[PDB]
Symmetry: D3
Subunit: 242 residues, 6 copies
């Protein structure tokens, strides 16, 4: 496939123009081969992931967390090595941050919701949709998470023992705590600074990992492109434990 059409389609499909306040540079971050034959999907940009893409002969690497964030950094040290690797392999680097978080079809959140049970889905803040029944299951939604992640999540029960309304927001959603108005809140990374507030306000919160929750978008996205363009794809795994 022509790389320039793939980039055009993706910018369109994810409509990255709708998230102009995302620090990360969404879209094609590093140019590679003009002819794409194999898609790679991964959570984070990094030398390790890049070496794996090189080994798996990936031509178009899609990541949720890219290389740019408004901060211009010198192409020195580990920044240089990363580029040498992409260059060496003619690898295209396409980054999708907030827009991949929010997307209703392949977005981290909508996708995870479904693979959980949530129904009556509706968007909630960027990146997500959250809030929508089951109805009435215990708080052992902590188990579906665990088996849908391979890792037992951290749960902070300040409220109920049974939840109905659930708001999802992968990655670092704690900043959104104050607006949470569901029986349960699902996110990835836990912050010490929100501990007491969570209980005092009787909130139920499950932390399933920043990596383990932002794994769902890239995968969906790659699968989507294979359905519509027949591009084969591979998932490049780099668990961080956070």
């Amino acid at each position: 496939m022509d790389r320039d059409e793939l980039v055009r389609y993706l910018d369109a499909y994810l409509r990255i123009q709708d998230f102009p306040q995302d620090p990360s540079l969404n879209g094609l971050q590093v140019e590679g081969k003009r002819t794409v034959r194999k898609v790679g999907a991964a959570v984070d940009a990094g030398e390790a992931i890049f070496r794996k893409a090189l080994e798996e002969e990936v031509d178009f690497l899609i990541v949720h967390h890219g290389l740019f964030w408004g901060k211009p950094f010198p192409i020195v040290g580990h920044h240089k090595r990363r580029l040498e690797t992409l260059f060496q392999g003619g690898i295209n680097l396409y980054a999708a941050h907030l827009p991949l978080d929010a997307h209703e079809e392949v977005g981290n959140n909508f996708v995870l919701a479904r693979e959980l049970g949530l129904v009556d889905l509706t968007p909630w803040d960027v990146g997500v949709k959250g809030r929508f029944p089951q109805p009435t299951p215990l708080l052992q939604v902590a188990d579906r998470l665990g088996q849908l992640t391979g890792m037992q999540p951290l749960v902070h029960q300040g409220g109920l023992d049974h939840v109905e309304t659930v708001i999802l927001v992968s990655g670092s959603g704690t900043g959104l705590l104050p607006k949470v108005d569901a029986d349960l809140f699902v996110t990835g990374e836990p912050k010490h600074s929100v501990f007491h507030e969570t209980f005092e306000r009787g909130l139920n919160v499950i932390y399933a990992g920043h990596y383990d929750t932002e794994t769902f978008g890239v995968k969906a996205l790659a699968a989507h492109l294979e359905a519509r363009f027949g591009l084969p794809w591979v998932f490049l795994d780099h668990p961080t434990g956070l």
Copy 2:
């Protein structure tokens, strides 16, 4: 014992003025009784810690994370309950953020660093930079930390198994990662987002918990007040696990 006397001391001693920028409103955050007889020390301001202060007749509660962060919120829900408890027990709430991270005699970093065996200590941002008198195995440092807090720390070994120069910044210090230039960096909370950079740069980092690294200052300061004015004190522990 006089409350306004104790506050002028702390402000001067902590050099509250040298930290204009700290989003935390440093100093007396909530006025309580005038005659202080027993001091209280705690990492976080919260209902659970306030009730404990109440139960133990604490007259002056010193906290590291206070209630104000330059963004006024309405007195409702948990916020109102928090003030009512303080009012009930006529408790003074004194908050010290950066001033206490940085203090050379009772601050979080200088105190932990000293107990950790580091020497030749010098200010480094709000933390400190020093060294071990001789190359020290990284696991042995991880252990000392574990003994000091009762919890085995998370170790990200991107470099050698031995270290000698160290940077210590308690709490959530991952923001300073790019500026780190020592064999080892000890901080509180880890962040998924600096994982790859840690290893690609070959940095050795040990995360010992936000709560567990920020208990030293508050304690050293109460102890200091007891030595200076004879005020008895208690530590109002409420481990967060983060």
Copy 3:
């Protein structure tokens, strides 16, 4: 009445979401009893007004000038005493700034206009509507003001002796002087810095007091709630002379 419904209704009725650039924190500023039985209305928040609300057994105090303005202040001194009073009386504090100024039904300005004569009403800048005929009365609209206020207003006649178009803007509207395009401008507080401009530009301006002009909203609002919910109300008077 349930306090939470009263707060929901008010936020709706005044549609405080339309004035996101108001420094004051509009809405419920301090929580009190959940069951409202008597409404209090006053121009300014303050210990005196609060003691009176306590004496009149007010459960839900509505003020135009509340406690918060983006500036986080320590709960010390007079700030603490104010809260003790609201707490002591289970008094709910609801503040309505710009939205109470502008409201077309109970807003300071629209209401005052009508009680003056103005017809063909239409909004003009936030807080007001201003500009609309009589038609053709002398400048002794300064007298209706005085008897509709109990105090003779200050009048600066730079233009006509008879006015037709009148713009109203209670409180401190002088900042809006440069845009005034009516035969007369009505506001509350006079500023030395606009003296010469007012005459040189042949403007007619009447200053009827900051307090005396922002008295009309709270009253209307309280009367509205009694018409729709049968809540009785009382006006808490604290004239400042400005």
Copy 4:
């Protein structure tokens, strides 16, 4: 007598440079004739004061509130008439805002404070802080003020009937109210919005008029020029009543 010579003097003497922040464009605001023979002094720049300067053959008009406030406006209406008058009489417009509030020899605050009997004067923001040699009754201070300006001042007595430490900030100084820490605070214009805080904090404040407190500096400075260069001067009075 040489106009550029007189301007370099004033800029240096007034220390115009030490006030970068002053929104007022300090210094020569409108160039006039080169040979200065008679100086003029006035609180405000305005058509009425400019015509008076014209009628009295004023060559160099020193003003406290000039025409520029870092927000360019078009030369139309009263703005153009203002410049035409200055051009007609070949009048130089020299404006000094904060530099003249603060000057220790001819500034508004130091001069008034001295005539008011205060001693041990020291800078306090752009005003001054000092004391009476002995506890002085508040009404006796109010009277001295009244004799000095010809108008009885507004007295907000939130504290004792006697005072000794005083803060003096001419003009609209109510902004510094929270920082005030003296038995008395004398300023120009009062503000409805700081009324309750004045009394709740127990502060004694005397408002003597914006115009009436800002006539001292301009006068002291002309008088100073006469002593230094023999230039005759006049005071172009135009009381504002505010």
Copy 5:
């Protein structure tokens, strides 16, 4: 013609309210005679142009580059002389920056396009429309420019030798280089900082002068007013060579 109607019409016709982010103060910058009898058009405000307007008895001078840009400057030196000249001649100064650049009827760009050949016109960024066929002419559009300007333009050919799509943006459009997506880009002033980028990206760029390209709006505008109001006009020429 009544000057106030002329100003109202112009503000309307150019709809200057649509360009609120233009540093220059668009509209009537300096007031003159109320009765307009002769229009003057010129590229830049300046003493020379003003003296010529005085000589040609212009009553209403229209310029693309006016006197104000948000920066308040003292009416001293050359700024004073400029005003004396406008005053002396009762000359009205009307400035039109971005809005005259963009206007589809008399705008610098649309007008120049037509006088060049471009068809299928459509706006592109402020000030212009750019991009639209011929179709297929060599790069000797550099000659039409030259004869339509009296001066041979500077041409930087990095791309084709024959162009079809052309984007126009008079004055200093280089800042827009990165978004240029046509076979040719037309602007007035060349910048050293865009040299290499222009070739490396295979862009064709023709620099026809800042003065020589922003000559077209004022002229059209004046001609428009003569067609609709019978006001005669004259063009005041001040070539700068840039």
Copy 6:
């Protein structure tokens, strides 16, 4: 010869730290080989200059205008080709903007000024201010400039035919025009927009090309490295004509 050694030298020597504000990322912008044998000097970073550096075995390329300006862009098109070329030749890219404009020994301004015959040189913004030992005809200065760069400079004579005090600010220095207070001002690129101000103020200005005035520093610095470390160097010329 050691690359990290050469970089610490340059940073210190150039006083890179004293220029925090420079939008240019000063220092090593792209890491290359560790063992430096031949230095390269050039005004601009660009593909044409990089290829030349490659062809001449340049190991360390010193440039005045680098690739980074605190606004990260994606590695695509010419941007990627630029890095590939540097990577190919293992070339280090060291960029010095303001530090090199201002350096007293090898900076652009001090060096040119000295070769131009000026004396009593002192810093003036990032340029320099000095004088000729005796009144010098403006055309004779224009000629010296012409001999120094091989191109006759543009002369805007708004003042006398003779000059003695001079301000020199290479590159695009027209921004400092309002602050200029010398008989002559020499800079690189002219700007249409400061044309009238130049003559109305009576200023003498000579524009000698952005590229032609910014070749001195880069050259002086390589020459300096050769004197200090024996490193041979070449000048990679690519005149821009601007």
